Amino acid sequence: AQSVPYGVSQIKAPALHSQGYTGSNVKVAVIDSGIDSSHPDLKVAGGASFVPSETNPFQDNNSHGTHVAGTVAALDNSIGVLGVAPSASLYAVKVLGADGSGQYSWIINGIEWAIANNMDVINMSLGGPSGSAALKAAVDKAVASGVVVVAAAGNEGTSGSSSTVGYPAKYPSVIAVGAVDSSNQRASFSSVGPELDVMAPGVSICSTLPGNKYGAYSGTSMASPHVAGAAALILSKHPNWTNTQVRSSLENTTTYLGDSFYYGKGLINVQAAAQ
Ligand SMILES: [Ca+2]
Ligand SMILES: [Ca+2]
């Protein structure tokens, strides 16, 4: 009794699953609060922890990382939910603690680890109001090394005529993801700005939670993994594509929904992006 979350269907992933493209052999690093590797609906391939006080990357004391990982790769079996790319090798890069916050050094150290270990895709469902020379350098170095870097735009809403997109999503190298609901309308919390690239489902998203549980969360943090998962599906069909060709295909085959200041290029359609 396996349920497919609306969001997985909304970006058209099941169409690729049926063709045999499920993200096999693609390494996706979920840079977050850790992932509960004991979840029956997840298979964590590796990981590392950069939080000084939480040395086990496979222990998610928050719940954020496990939910985010489940959107990316919850297994295709007869239990729980289904992920966007269920055959992806999932890596837990724990940079946030039990309180859901982390220090930039920890996050940057996590991005660095991801580059060194050849992650194909990096998902950052995190972000702050300020950036740094070191934060830009890390995400720029990952993209130069062929990694697809996806990040949550932020949950700051609108503000006059200002961009409310956070970092690292604000850097040109990072694909910034905003959130939409089931009806393709922008979630009122979703950050806006000319830095927004794509939109993905982000309201009441059902996924995995520590302790063999399932729960729904809302935020651009939930939108982001739909796009990191999409990137993995596309690489399983076209492993020769560079990170640049993966991003172009994603941005260029979206379903146009309003002005780009609010919706980026629109809703991703991985069926059209995978070719
Ligand atoms: Ca499942
Ligand atoms: Ca960006």
Curated annotation (Swiss-Prot):
Subtilisin is an extracellular alkaline serine protease, it catalyzes the hydrolysis of proteins and peptide amides. Has a high substrate specificity to fibrin. Completely inhibited by phenylmethylsulfony fluoride (PMSF) and partially inhibited by benzamidine hydrochloride, leupeptin, and pepstatin A. Ca(2+) 2 binds at residues 169, 171, 174. This is Subtilisin BPN'. It comes from Bacillus amyloliquefaciens. Secretion of subtilisin is associated with onset of sporulation, and many mutations which block sporulation at early stages affect expression levels of subtilisin. However, subtilisin is not necessary for normal sporulation. The chain holds residues 108 to 382 of 382 of the full protein. It catalyses: Hydrolysis of proteins with broad specificity for peptide bonds, and a preference for a large uncharged residue in P1. Hydrolyzes peptide amides. Monomer.
